[PDB]
């Protein structure tokens, strides 16, 4: 809850700094290629698979 | 996510007399939550010697086929001691380390005049006992061997250990399991070795 | 975590605590009270969280000795432990406490010596190793306590416990707080190792 | 482990001179009724039959290993025989962790023995007069086992397995009322166009709706 | 389980308890869990029966073939060195394996003690197993280098019936062993009730 | 279990399987499933066993404090309402399913009830591990019957699970509420018999006391 | 888990006018066992008794609640309860914490106001199993329940019970390794109790 | 589940399975799912079986307390804005109504899962709703007869039960219209020999 | 891969025993609803949402 | 995405939709998903777009491999079967074809997602396809004519347009008969505006 | 947070003396456009409309606190005392950790000042002459603002509004050609009927596909 502000300030460590961070709320040149979070190439259209059994895989 | 294995296991006894070794396993081969056949037999022979199995039953008889190819390959000069076979069938199992048997292997036999039972676990290591029980009812039937057959505890004199009064503890024994245990069988197939042979009984357990 | 060991003879009882207070790091002090006498007829140390620890061991002092003022409760060391053993289940399965104590002193019956650990669970024993004592030093125990042990033979088993921590025992220990309580009052013994 | 076309359970039973092998004809993706004629039953070679349940993928992957080692080998094999190699074929595939999502019921006459056996997903085999696989285990197995199997005719048994075949397609989602049964006697493997079986529900009326 | 071995002016002393469990069932109580490979290099296994025993019996021919080969006896450097590079082979896989490879290198007795991590210390003394800490602390107070023979051994025998006495995972028979310069002697096997 | 549940022309049949267990371990024979909640209503109950007998207690006091009150004779709706509302607040926590049948002013009613609060109207029902194996019984053999006829069918469901589900043996109770009164059936059938092992006997003598305290009641 | 931690087991055994309730002597803090001297059972009077396994706290504490419970019901009653009642009321506290339940199984041993042998035993919610032939809790309950099964007739005589219970609890424990070394055996009948000591292993 | 309702010349027809299922196994096939709010209102239950029926219970004593209040029949509106409020203000019951009655003239509302409440002239729900959304489409005619719209639910849900596994079972319709409640029964016995 | 068999046996603790045990492969007397595995109460049977976008929820 | 086949009198009649979907962004909303195997030979792909298409670039050159080597027209039998190896043989592929040609005789071989391959009379694939099950099964028709299949697919392919979010535009369409494949083109204004 | 049923997009620009707002009329389940007549512009009073998107239910239940506020206090409201009451709602919605899943924008004039707001589920908010909300501030946001919508009169502000709705269609899942366009000017609030947008897909037709 209180986020633990300061820990690395406060310990040796054997990154919270004392002041809070923006964005507390890589080494790679990434980019994005579309302005959607996660989405890279077209969705996977088919039907998908429910309902049925997941936990009773084997009792056809 | 996917489990290799499943556990068909009921009990299975062996126990070495001084003359005789009395191997007993019930006939019930258990699915989960239901019972596939009541006639399965766990115990296999290897000549003079009996094999009896637990656990997952497609891995024991796969196990059960591998020492047996093993031995013929053996045989072509001598026949296999007991406890040339017993050291095999752990090498054989311990090979599995990292995709284990889930059988536990109780390997008995003579050894020209002394009786031998040998227990393994299922990466491999074998004793040598005396009693040994396996299955999901060795805790309702190995204290019991260790009282009334082994005599521990018994601070008195102790009642003479023939083959006839085993026989009986082992009924009890195996009473007391299939009353107790959800997973015993409804037959307990019993074998008898003696130094020149061995024979096979079956007797009747509660059908639940 | 923290060492203790205790002793109970025929008219005396030792508790031997590791008096340094460390993290799992630094070592923050090396002689620290870690005891509570009361009427000088129990003594009970705290072990476990300080944090936790000195707060709860703080509040059964203060409601033992209003107890024994204003409702004229005997405080003896089975009264200690029991008022310990509340106090630690009634946070358990709500706030818990991590701390646990040995409560020791003289009875009617006898000399008592108490254990209460994390879970509140209460025994008596005629002797007690809480901490890391409990692996190490009970062959001890075993093999030099009997119920004839004088009060030098008493402390000198408690030194060859807290020996076994300080040669084989890899986090550091250097300093033991030793109170005898006994019918002549309590006994305040503090080693080195 | 493949789990996306499923066919539901297998039936077989052995009777006074034969065995019977039965399965439905429907084939599930999820909740799905994808195909409604996926047949699951073939013949080995004369005298024995065999049924597969599971990933329709599985099997039909095991039915062509099957049939090419059933092309290649030049000495006939008894059902028992059968059994053997496809036991061995789940059980090695199961030991390479990468198992066939597929239960199988192989079922065949010798020259005097009837051979009724099972092989799941993880080589796990037994034999029994009564096999059933997958929810058939648990709803037809304990209704089937009720009836003294061993002294019925043919008809007798058929109609005891088509009774049973009804019971799941009551009981179980993954089950139609469209099946398909392959029989086995001495000198005789009939494998029927798959037929429909006929239903009731006048147990769901209540107190007056119309019979419309 | 509770294994022990330590070197003392004499000679050297080994001493385990013989119990084998399997959760909370005792599986057996007359487990062997000292491997003798020849007259003087034995190993105390500990951990996983059948994984100690089997690197144990494949370290043990090792040594017969090394002896085969150069006629001569293997070092216990040697010996505890294969044993130690084959669990490290399955470093990180899980293996769970801790052993001592007691013997004598003609006139000089070393212990070495060996874990699945590949970890390899030569001491002169180590318990290991479950009940290694009551061990440990039964030989730190009595535990001498100048001991007797007579002494040696009962401190042994007495420290293995303490860790049993106090832990769960120990508490079969107390099987001892005296590593002399002209090899091992099987001392008994010790029932811990009968003390 | 297979407790069962069949509803005839002017009753019900609540059976039940003897038979108690904690993961492969038989922990009760002869153990009673048909709990008792009103002279005219049983119910019957799979899962954890503390909360089938609490949940069942409850409904047998709000049912008996309803007749005493009003004295008038509870409806089976009363007692599944009472269910449901304390179920349902605990999503599923307190794991009780009851097979809740009786005779009311209205008729007989058997009602199947589930963890989660849910309840419903049934013609027959199977619960438990051996649900399946009777359910396939009342599929194949149920039809409008008499207490006769549906006393020999829930019978033979109950049958079915005990030879067919590991978790299910022993004895079947039986009990059947009709507008004539509840009669029960206590271990109505002995499918799961056991064998007749002799005694054994230790010597006194293998047995030593190390000390005996001994004290009297008064 | 919390039970493993401490261990220890129970066995009631009901022969003819006469119950044996025995147990073990261990403690445990895990694989260690910190006192060789801790019975688990309790004795509210000669004829009610009771012993819990699991978090050895919530065993004590479930105690002192139903110490206090069973007086307050004395002084209401005048009349001493039977074991049932007992049994029903533990039952019944135990439930209470349906949400956070204790970590113990409790078995209730004692002799009817009729001078009837009774027995017991709960779960950690109350589920609650009158026996007439044995019940067992605790680590070795399933080698006690297994060995009392084969060994165990009905009507055994005051010593052929306690010879036979004792066997059976000796045995089982040998084969658990939580199980502990000093027992103690609590004879049973309606003149009061025998408390009643023995020894196994040493280990 | 199939749950349909469809507003017609003079009423409403709701038609329903009577497959009820967990997992691969049919714990019921004979489950009521027309369940009645009052004497001229019905529920379609659709979503968590132990939720719905806690709603329906609840609506149920709602709309008759209102009505008493007021003086008036049940409006079905108003035991659909009930409904609306428990499944909103309780995001962890999973529930979905189609709650169709006569009160002065057929209303069809529709509670979605998260609360979204509209109304209709035609409505389908359940898991089997998803394979005939194209045939009620297409087949959906305004104003239909009676014998028409009870086709027009026959050919709907039976297509519907042949496609998705959780649905089966002979199809529950009732005719809410300002006469009473009329109940019909299309068995199973058709729908699979057909 | 190897299981951790024995590590109970080999360290004080400060349940891998030193034989494999089956169960490798609560104190409740709970009893089974049905059968099926973790099944014991009917299925939710609605329409269930799919597709959409759960990587972007407020791009309505 | 909606995806179908249906056998007409002497043809092979497929069709889609033109939507590409990436969550709620069309990435495109002309891709062509009648994928051309070979000149008699077509298979509509549902899936992953790029495994899918790894397949259908692999089994183009099998198809013509074995043609010319035993002299033949490429069979689509041959064309289902080696999509068929390839979807089983990699698990990690998530793939699905409607293979769809005429050899000698029309013929339409569904290789559904974990390589369950079935021959079909009409077929349907796709998220789309969920929502026309019903619609098919009562329309659909043996031995249509073209008109007849034209119009089957336009109903059917149009209904499912409507509901699925992730089925849009235009409706490509393509029969496959023995004097070869024309192709054909249903607007998506006449099908949006209508 | 409702993520269930779902609107898809709101624009709303001012032009020349006046205000626009449009939204589709879809609401989606999913993939599934389970309802084609779900409207979402709302008048305020008489110089003021709110359009909604995101969660419908949570739509419902604003607009529902919004008519109460409206018919309770007895002092009438400009546009940007909705903004600040709608800002509020949503803002103490959000920092009660059960925000709704709706995002608005708020449309008026008074005396002659023109209101174009957005508030977002958040409670953030800010106001601009063009404010779009979901994937349309995103793909019809960037294409508006190439306009100087300040200088259109409401034909052509309509007509702009509808090829931005017409990109949406093409180029958003959850957005259909059925639309609804609110207006405020001086004197006048207008709601049109939804009506259908005519679309080409021209692009597509290739040389030789035969157009049917």
């Given at each position: 809850?209180?986020?633990?502000?300061?820990?690395?300030?406060?310990?040796?460590?054997?990154?919270?700094?004392?002041?809070?961070?923006?964005?507390?709320?890589?080494?790679?040149?990434?980019?994005?290629?579309?302005?959607?979070?996660?989405?890279?190439?077209?969705?996977?259209?088919?039907?998908?698979?429910?309902?049925?059994?997941?936990?009773?895989?084997?009792?056809? | 996510?996917?489990?290799?294995?499943?556990?068909?296991?009921?009990?299975?006894?062996?126990?070495?007399?001084?003359?005789?070794?009395?191997?007993?396993?019930?006939?019930?081969?258990?699915?989960?939550?239901?019972?596939?056949?009541?006639?399965?037999?766990?115990?296999?022979?290897?000549?003079?010697?009996?094999?009896?199995?637990?656990?997952?039953?497609?891995?024991?008889?796969?196990?059960?086929?591998?020492?047996?190819?093993?031995?013929?390959?053996?045989?072509?000069?001598?026949?296999?001691?007991?406890?040339?076979?017993?050291?095999?069938?752990?090498?054989?199992?311990?090979?599995?380390?990292?995709?284990?048997?889930?059988?536990?292997?109780?390997?008995?036999?003579?050894?020209?005049?002394?009786?031998?039972?040998?227990?393994?676990?299922?990466?491999?290591?074998?004793?040598?006992?005396?009693?040994?029980?396996?299955?999901?009812?060795?805790?309702?039937?190995?204290?019991?061997?260790?009282?009334?057959?082994?005599?521990?505890?018994?601070?008195?004199?102790?009642?003479?250990?023939?083959?006839?009064?085993?026989?009986?503890?082992?009924?009890?024994?195996?009473?007391?399991?299939?009353?107790?245990?959800?997973?015993?069988?409804?037959?307990?197939?019993?074998?008898?070795?003696?130094?020149?042979?061995?024979?096979?009984?079956?007797?009747?357990?509660?059908?639940? | 975590?923290?060492?203790?060991?205790?002793?109970?003879?025929?008219?005396?009882?030792?508790?031997?605590?590791?008096?340094?207070?460390?993290?799992?790091?630094?070592?923050?002090?090396?002689?620290?009270?870690?005891?509570?006498?009361?009427?000088?007829?129990?003594?009970?140390?705290?072990?476990?969280?300080?944090?936790?620890?000195?707060?709860?061991?703080?509040?059964?002092?203060?409601?033992?000795?209003?107890?024994?003022?204003?409702?004229?409760?005997?405080?003896?060391?089975?009264?200690?432990?029991?008022?310990?053993?509340?106090?630690?289940?009634?946070?358990?399965?709500?706030?818990?406490?991590?701390?646990?104590?040995?409560?020791?002193?003289?009875?009617?019956?006898?000399?008592?010596?108490?254990?209460?650990?994390?879970?509140?669970?209460?025994?008596?024993?005629?002797?007690?190793?809480?901490?890391?004592?409990?692996?190490?030093?009970?062959?001890?125990?075993?093999?030099?306590?009997?119920?004839?042990?004088?009060?030098?033979?008493?402390?000198?088993?408690?030194?060859?416990?807290?020996?076994?921590?300080?040669?084989?025992?890899?986090?550091?220990?250097?300093?033991?707080?030793?109170?005898?309580?006994?019918?002549?009052?309590?006994?305040?013994?503090?080693?080195?190792? | 482990?493949?789990?996306?076309?499923?066919?539901?359970?297998?039936?077989?039973?052995?009777?006074?001179?034969?065995?019977?092998?039965?399965?439905?004809?429907?084939?599930?993706?999820?909740?799905?009724?994808?195909?409604?004629?996926?047949?699951?039953?073939?013949?080995?070679?004369?005298?024995?039959?065999?049924?597969?349940?599971?990933?329709?993928?599985?099997?039909?992957?095991?039915?062509?290993?099957?049939?090419?080692?059933?092309?290649?080998?030049?000495?006939?094999?008894?059902?028992?025989?059968?059994?053997?190699?496809?036991?061995?074929?789940?059980?090695?595939?199961?030991?390479?962790?990468?198992?066939?999502?597929?239960?199988?019921?192989?079922?065949?006459?010798?020259?005097?023995?009837?051979?009724?056996?099972?092989?799941?997903?993880?080589?796990?085999?037994?034999?029994?007069?009564?096999?059933?696989?997958?929810?058939?285990?648990?709803?037809?197995?304990?209704?089937?086992?009720?009836?003294?199997?061993?002294?019925?005719?043919?008809?007798?048994?058929?109609?005891?397995?088509?009774?049973?075949?009804?019971?799941?397609?009551?009981?179980?989602?993954?089950?139609?009322?469209?099946?398909?049964?392959?029989?086995?006697?001495?000198?005789?493997?009939?494998?029927?166009?798959?037929?429909v079986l006929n239903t009731d529900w006048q147990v769901g009326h209540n107190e007056e709706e119309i019979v419309l | 389980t509770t294994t022990l071995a330590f070197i003392f002016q004499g000679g050297m002393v080994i001493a385990v308890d013989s119990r084998a469990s399997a959760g909370s069932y005792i599986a057996s109580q007359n487990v062997h869990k000292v491997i003798r490979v020849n007259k003087h290099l034995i190993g105390t296994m500990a951990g996983g029966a059948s994984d100690c025993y089997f690197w144990e019996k494949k370290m043990g021919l090792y040594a017969k073939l090394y002896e085969l080969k150069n006629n001569k006896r293997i070092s216990v450097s040697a010996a505890s060195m294969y044993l130690s590079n084959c669990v490290y082979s399955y470093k990180g896989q899980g293996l769970s394996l801790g052993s001592m490879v007691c013997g004598y290198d003609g006139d000089k007795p070393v212990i070495y003690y060996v874990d699945d991590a590949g970890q390899r210390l030569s001491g002169d003394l180590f318990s290991v197993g479950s009940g290694s800490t009551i061990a440990y602390?039964?030989?730190?107070?009595?535990?001498?280098?100048?001991?007797?023979?007579?002494?040696?051994?009962?401190?042994?025998?007495?420290?293995?019936?303490?860790?049993?006495?106090?832990?769960?995972?120990?508490?079969?028979?107390?099987?001892?062993?005296?590593?002399?310069?002209?090899?091992?002697?099987?001392?008994?096997?010790?029932?811990?009730?009968?003390? | 279990?297979?407790?069962?549940?069949?509803?005839?022309?002017?009753?019900?049949?609540?059976?039940?399987?003897?038979?108690?267990?904690?993961?492969?371990?038989?922990?009760?024979?002869?153990?009673?499933?048909?709990?008792?909640?009103?002279?005219?209503?049983?119910?019957?109950?799979?899962?954890?066993?503390?909360?089938?007998?609490?949940?069942?207690?409850?409904?047998?006091?709000?049912?008996?404090?309803?007749?005493?009150?009003?004295?008038?004779?509870?409806?089976?709706?009363?007692?599944?309402?009472?269910?449901?509302?304390?179920?349902?607040?605990?999503?599923?926590?307190?794991?009780?399913?009851?097979?809740?049948?009786?005779?009311?002013?209205?008729?007989?009613?058997?009602?199947?009830?589930?963890?989660?609060?849910?309840?419903?109207?049934?013609?027959?029902?199977?619960?438990?591990?051996?649900?399946?194996?009777?359910?396939?019984?009342?599929?194949?053999?149920?039809?409008?019957?008499?207490?006769?006829?549906?006393?020999?069918?829930?019978?033979?469901?109950?049958?079915?699970?005990?030879?067919?589900?590991?978790?299910?043996?022993?004895?079947?109770?039986?009990?059947?509420?009709?507008?004539?009164?509840?009669?029960?059936?206590?271990?109505?059938?002995?499918?799961?018999?056991?064998?007749?092992?002799?005694?054994?006997?230790?010597?006194?003598?293998?047995?030593?006391?190390?000390?005996?305290?001994?004290?009297?009641?008064? | 888990?919390?039970?493993?931690?401490?261990?220890?087991?129970?066995?009631?055994?009901?022969?003819?006018?006469?119950?044996?309730?025995?147990?073990?002597?261990?403690?445990?803090?895990?694989?260690?066992?910190?006192?060789?001297?801790?019975?688990?059972?309790?004795?509210?009077?000669?004829?009610?008794?009771?012993?819990?396994?699991?978090?050895?706290?919530?065993?004590?504490?479930?105690?002192?609640?139903?110490?206090?419970?069973?007086?307050?019901?004395?002084?209401?009653?005048?009349?001493?309860?039977?074991?049932?009642?007992?049994?029903?009321?533990?039952?019944?506290?135990?439930?209470?914490?349906?949400?956070?339940?204790?970590?113990?199984?409790?078995?209730?041993?004692?002799?009817?106001?009729?001078?009837?042998?009774?027995?017991?035993?709960?779960?950690?919610?109350?589920?609650?199993?009158?026996?007439?032939?044995?019940?067992?809790?605790?680590?070795?309950?399933?080698?006690?329940?297994?060995?009392?099964?084969?060994?165990?007739?009905?009507?055994?005589?005051?010593?052929?019970?306690?010879?036979?219970?004792?066997?059976?609890?000796?045995?089982?424990?040998?084969?658990?390794?939580?199980?502990?070394?000093?027992?103690?055996?609590?004879?049973?009948?309606?003149?009061?109790?025998?408390?009643?000591?023995?020894?196994?292993?040493?280990? | 589940?199939?749950?349909?309702?469809?507003?017609?010349?003079?009423?409403?027809?709701?038609?329903?399975?009577?497959?009820?299922?967990?997992?691969?196994?049919?714990?019921?096939?004979?489950?009521?799912?027309?369940?009645?709010?009052?004497?001229?209102?019905?529920?379609?239950?659709?979503?968590?079986?132990?939720?719905?029926?806690?709603?329906?219970?609840?609506?149920?004593?709602?709309?008759?307390?209102?009505?008493?209040?007021?003086?008036?029949?049940?409006?079905?509106?108003?035991?659909?804005?009930?409904?609306?409020?428990?499944?909103?203000?309780?995001?962890?019951?999973?529930?979905?109504?189609?709650?169709?009655?006569?009160?002065?003239?057929?209303?069809?509302?529709?509670?979605?899962?998260?609360?979204?409440?509209?109304?209709?002239?035609?409505?389908?729900?359940?898991?089997?709703?998803?394979?005939?959304?194209?045939?009620?489409?297409?087949?959906?005619?305004?104003?239909?007869?009676?014998?028409?719209?009870?086709?027009?639910?026959?050919?709907?849900?039976?297509?519907?039960?042949?496609?998705?596994?959780?649905?089966?079972?002979?199809?529950?319709?009732?005719?809410?219209?300002?006469?009473?409640?009329?109940?019909?029964?299309?068995?199973?016995?058709?729908?699979?020999?057909?």
């Amino acid at each position: 809850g209180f986020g633990n502000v300061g820990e690395d300030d406060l310990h040796p460590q054997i990154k919270k700094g004392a002041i809070f961070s923006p964005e507390e709320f890589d080494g790679i040149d990434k980019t994005d290629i579309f302005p959607l979070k996660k989405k890279r190439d077209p969705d996977s259209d088919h039907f998908k698979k429910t309902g049925g059994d997941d936990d009773n895989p084997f009792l056809y | 996510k996917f489990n290799p294995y499943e556990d068909n296991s009921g009990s299975t006894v062996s126990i070495r007399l001084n003359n005789s070794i009395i191997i007993a396993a019930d006939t019930r081969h258990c699915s989960e939550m239901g019972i596939y056949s009541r006639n399965t037999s766990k115990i296999f022979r290897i000549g003079d010697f009996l094999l009896t199995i637990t656990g997952f039953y497609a891995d024991g008889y796969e196990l059960y086929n591998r020492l047996k190819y093993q031995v013929q390959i053996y045989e072509s000069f001598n026949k296999i001691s007991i406890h040339s076979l017993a050291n095999l069938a752990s090498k054989i199992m311990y090979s599995k380390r990292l995709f284990p048997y889930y059988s536990y292997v109780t390997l008995s036999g003579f050894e020209g005049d002394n009786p031998y039972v040998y227990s393994f676990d299922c990466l491999g290591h074998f004793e040598e006992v005396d009693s040994v029980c396996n299955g999901s009812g060795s805790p309702l039937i190995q204290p019991l061997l260790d009282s009334t057959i082994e005599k521990k505890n018994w601070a008195g004199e102790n009642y003479e250990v023939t083959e006839e009064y085993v026989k009986d503890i082992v009924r009890r024994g195996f009473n007391a399991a299939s009353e107790r245990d959800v997973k015993t069988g409804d037959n307990v197939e019993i074998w008898i070795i003696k130094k020149d042979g061995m024979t096979k009984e079956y007797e009747r357990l509660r059908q639940d | 975590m923290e060492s203790s060991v205790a002793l109970k003879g025929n008219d005396f009882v030792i508790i031997g605590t590791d008096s340094s207070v460390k993290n799992s790091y630094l070592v923050l002090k090396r002689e620290e009270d870690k005891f509570y006498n009361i009427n000088n007829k129990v003594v009970f140390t705290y072990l476990g969280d300080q944090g936790d620890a000195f707060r709860t061991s703080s509040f059964i002092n203060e409601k033992l000795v209003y107890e024994e003022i204003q409702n004229n409760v005997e405080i003896t060391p089975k009264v200690t432990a029991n008022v310990i053993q509340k106090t630690l289940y009634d946070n358990l399965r709500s706030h818990p406490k991590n701390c646990y104590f040995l409560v020791g002193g003289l009875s009617q019956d006898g000399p008592e010596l108490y254990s209460v650990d994390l879970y509140g669970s209460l025994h008596e024993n005629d002797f007690m190793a809480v901490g890391i004592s409990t692996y190490f030093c009970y062959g001890v125990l075993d093999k030099e306590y009997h119920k004839n042990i004088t009060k030098e033979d008493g402390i000198k088993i408690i030194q060859k416990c807290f020996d076994v921590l300080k040669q084989r025992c890899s986090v550091d220990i250097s300093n033991i707080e030793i109170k005898i309580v006994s019918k002549e009052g309590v006994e305040t013994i503090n080693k080195v190792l | 482990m493949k789990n996306f076309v499923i066919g539901s359970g297998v039936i077989s039973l052995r009777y006074k001179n034969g065995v019977i092998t039965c399965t439905d004809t429907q084939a599930s993706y999820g909740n799905l009724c994808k195909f409604n004629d996926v047949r699951r039953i073939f013949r080995l070679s004369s005298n024995t039959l065999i049924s597969l349940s599971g990933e329709i993928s599985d099997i039909q992957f095991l039915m062509n290993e099957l049939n090419k080692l059933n092309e290649s080998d030049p000495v006939k094999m008894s059902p028992r025989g059968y059994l053997n190699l496809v036991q061995g074929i789940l059980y090695n595939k199961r030991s390479r962790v990468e198992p066939l999502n597929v239960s199988v019921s192989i079922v065949g006459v010798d020259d005097d023995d009837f051979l009724v056996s099972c092989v799941n997903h993880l080589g796990n085999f037994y034999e029994d007069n009564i096999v059933c696989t997958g929810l058939s285990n648990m709803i037809a197995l304990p209704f089937l086992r009720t009836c003294n199997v061993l002294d019925l005719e043919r008809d007798e048994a058929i109609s005891l397995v088509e009774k049973a075949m009804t019971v799941m397609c009551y009981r179980s989602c993954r089950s139609s009322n469209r099946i398909q049964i392959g029989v086995v006697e001495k000198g005789l493997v009939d494998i029927s166009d798959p037929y429909v079986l006929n239903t009731d529900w006048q147990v769901g009326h209540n107190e007056e709706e119309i019979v419309l | 389980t509770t294994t022990l071995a330590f070197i003392f002016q004499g000679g050297m002393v080994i001493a385990v308890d013989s119990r084998a469990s399997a959760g909370s069932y005792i599986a057996s109580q007359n487990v062997h869990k000292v491997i003798r490979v020849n007259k003087h290099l034995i190993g105390t296994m500990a951990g996983g029966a059948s994984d100690c025993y089997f690197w144990e019996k494949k370290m043990g021919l090792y040594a017969k073939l090394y002896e085969l080969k150069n006629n001569k006896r293997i070092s216990v450097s040697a010996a505890s060195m294969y044993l130690s590079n084959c669990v490290y082979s399955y470093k990180g896989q899980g293996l769970s394996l801790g052993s001592m490879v007691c013997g004598y290198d003609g006139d000089k007795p070393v212990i070495y003690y060996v874990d699945d991590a590949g970890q390899r210390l030569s001491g002169d003394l180590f318990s290991v197993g479950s009940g290694s800490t009551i061990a440990y602390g039964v030989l730190n107070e009595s535990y001498r280098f100048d001991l007797t023979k007579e002494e040696a051994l009962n401190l042994g025998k007495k420290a293995i019936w303490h860790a049993t006495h106090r832990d769960a995972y120990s508490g079969g028979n107390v099987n001892l062993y005296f590593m002399d310069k002209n090899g091992w002697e099987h001392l008994g096997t010790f029932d811990v009730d009968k003390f | 279990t297979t407790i069962v549940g069949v509803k005839y022309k002017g009753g019900v049949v609540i059976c039940a399987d003897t038979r108690s267990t904690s993961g492969p371990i038989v922990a009760d024979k002869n153990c009673s499933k048909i709990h008792y909640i009103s002279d005219n209503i049983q119910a019957c109950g799979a899962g954890t066993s503390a909360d089938i007998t609490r949940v069942t207690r409850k409904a047998s006091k709000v049912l008996s404090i309803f007749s005493k009150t009003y004295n008038r004779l509870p409806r089976v709706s009363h007692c599944v309402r009472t269910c449901q509302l304390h179920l349902h607040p605990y999503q599923g926590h307190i794991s009780a399913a009851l097979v809740v049948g009786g005779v009311d002013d209205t008729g007989a009613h058997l009602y199947d009830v589930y963890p989660h609060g849910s309840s419903n109207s049934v013609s027959y029902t199977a619960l438990g591990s051996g649900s399946l194996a009777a359910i396939s019984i009342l599929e194949a053999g149920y039809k409008d019957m008499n207490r006769e006829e549906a006393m020999e069918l829930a019978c033979a469901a109950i049958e079915a699970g005990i030879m067919n589900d590991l978790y299910s043996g022993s004895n079947i109770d039986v009990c059947v509420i009709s507008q004539e009164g509840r009669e029960m059936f206590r271990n109505y059938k002995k499918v799961g018999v056991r064998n007749e092992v002799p005694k054994f006997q230790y010597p006194r003598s293998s047995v030593k006391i190390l000390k005996e305290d001994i004290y009297k009641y008064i | 888990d919390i039970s493993q931690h401490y261990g220890g087991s129970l066995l009631a055994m009901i022969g003819k006018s006469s119950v044996a309730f025995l147990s073990d002597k261990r403690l445990g803090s895990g694989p260690i066992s910190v006192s060789k001297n801790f019975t688990k059972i309790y004795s509210l009077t000669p004829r009610l008794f009771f012993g819990f396994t699991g978090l050895v706290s919530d065993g004590e504490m479930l105690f002192k609640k139903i110490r206090k419970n069973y007086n307050l019901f004395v002084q209401d009653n005048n009349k001493d309860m039977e074991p049932s009642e007992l049994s029903n009321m533990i039952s019944y506290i135990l439930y209470q914490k349906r949400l956070q339940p204790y970590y113990v199984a409790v078995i209730v041993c004692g002799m009817t106001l009729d001078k009837k042998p009774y027995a017991s035993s709960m779960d950690c919610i109350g589920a609650m199993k009158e026996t007439s032939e044995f019940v067992t809790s605790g680590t070795a309950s399933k080698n006690l329940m297994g060995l009392s099964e084969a060994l165990f007739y009905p009507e055994m005589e005051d010593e052929d019970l306690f010879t036979t219970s004792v066997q059976t609890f000796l045995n089982s424990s040998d084969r658990d390794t939580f199980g502990g070394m000093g027992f103690e055996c609590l004879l049973i009948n309606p003149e009061g109790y025998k408390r009643r000591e023995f020894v196994g292993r040493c280990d | 589940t199939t749950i349909m309702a469809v507003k017609y010349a003079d009423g409403i027809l709701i038609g329903a399975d009577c497959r009820t299922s967990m997992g691969t196994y049919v714990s019921s096939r004979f489950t009521d799912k027309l369940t009645k709010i009052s004497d001229n209102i019905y529920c379609c239950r659709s979503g968590s079986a132990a939720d719905t029926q806690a709603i329906t219970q609840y609506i149920t004593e709602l709309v008759q307390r209102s009505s008493f209040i007021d003086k008036e029949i049940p409006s079905v509106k108003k035991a659909a804005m009930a409904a609306k409020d428990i499944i909103y203000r309780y995001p962890n019951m999973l529930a979905g109504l189609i709650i169709a009655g006569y009160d002065t003239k057929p209303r069809i509302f529709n509670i979605s899962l998260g609360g979204t409440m509209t109304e209709a002239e035609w409505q389908i729900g359940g898991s089997g709703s998803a394979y005939i959304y194209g045939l009620c489409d297409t087949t959906f005619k305004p104003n239909m007869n009676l014998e028409e719209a009870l086709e027009f639910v026959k050919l709907a849900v039976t297509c519907a039960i042949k496609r998705d596994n959780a649905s089966g079972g002979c199809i529950r319709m009732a005719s809410i219209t300002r006469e009473g409640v009329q109940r019909f029964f299309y068995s199973g016995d058709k729908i699979l020999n057909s």
